[PDB]
Structures are given as structure tokens and as C-alpha cells.
Design a binder for this molecule. Structure first.
Ligand SMILES: Nc1ncnc2c1ncn2[C@@H]1O[C@H](COP(=O)(O)OP(=O)(O)OP(=O)(O)O)[C@@H](O)[C@H]1O
Ligand SMILES: [Mg+2]
Length: 107
């Protein structure tokens, strides 16, 4: 009778450089290193990080990253070009939950 409907999410290898990280990270250096070790020997055991995928007023794609901080840090320390990310389609109102009056008028 019924179906489940929701926002589109898709896992991709996303260049680290395109992830916008507005806020500072709180990091346990031990956990970053444990993650670096895991990524090196068993990357499949490290899930994709969740990323807001926002399309702006004129169709620009923007990728906002808030969580996944330890994984993000670990991929940076490995000088990786990309990171596995679950791109979750999100609206500017979704973004405003994080950014409030600082939310950009994305184009
Ligand atoms: N060696 C490891 N150390 C920590 N987490 C690991 C490790 N290997 C795999 N994982 C997995 O990676 C994910 C890490 O998520 P977690 O929420 O702990 O940190 P984060 O999201 O990267 O950073 P934060 O939550 O601080 O923003 C979890 O799914 C965990 O099971
Ligand atoms: Mg987390």
C-alpha cells in the first residue's frame, strides 16, 4: 500500500578540497591516529562521512561538512585526494540549522 520517501543520499569519493568546514573540530589525537592506522590496513571498516549536498539558487553544488571530524582529520594526515562521503541532499533551511544568521545565499 505505502512507500518510504525521503531525501536522496549517495556515497561518493569526494575530493577533500571541495568540503566546506565552517566550524572547528574537537579531536582526540589518539583517535585520529587509530583511524589513520585503520584506513591504511582496513579502509572498508571506516564508513563514509556524512556531507550536506546543497544546490544553490543558480544550481551550484556545495558540500558542507560538520561531523566526521576524526575521519576527515585522518584522511588529511594521509594526504588523500578523496574521502568516502555520503552526500545527503539538503536545503538552505537545513544548512541554517548549523549556521543560523551566517547562512550564505548560495548560488
Ligand atoms: N580505528 C578506529 N577508531 C575509531 N573509529 C573507527 C576505527 N575504525 C573504524 N571506525 C569507525 O569509524 C566511524 C568513526 O565515527 P566517530 O563518530 O567515532 O568519529 P567521527 O565521526 O570521524 O568524528 P566526530 O564524531 O568526532 O565528528 C565509526 O563508524 C567507527 O565504527
Ligand atoms: Mg561522528
Amino acid at each position: 500500500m505505502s512507500i518510504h520517501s525521503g531525501r536522496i543520499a549517495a556515497v561518493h569519493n569526494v575530493p577533500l578540497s571541495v568540503l566546506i568546514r565552517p566550524l572547528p573540530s574537537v579531536l582526540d589525537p589518539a583517535k585520529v591516529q587509530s583511524l589513520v592506522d585503520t584506513i591504511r590496513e582496513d579502509p572498508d571498516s571506516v564508513p563514509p562521512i556524512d556531507v550536506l549536498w546543497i544546490k544553490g539558487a543558480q544550481g551550484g553544488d556545495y558540500f558542507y561538512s560538520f561531523g566526521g571530524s576524526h575521519r576527515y582529520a585522518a584522511y588529511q594526515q594521509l594526504q588523500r585526494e578523496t574521502i568516502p562521503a555520503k552526500l545527503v541532499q539538503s536545503t538552505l533551511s537545513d544548512l541554517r540549522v548549523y549556521l543560523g544568521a551566517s547562512t550564505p545565499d548560495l548560488q
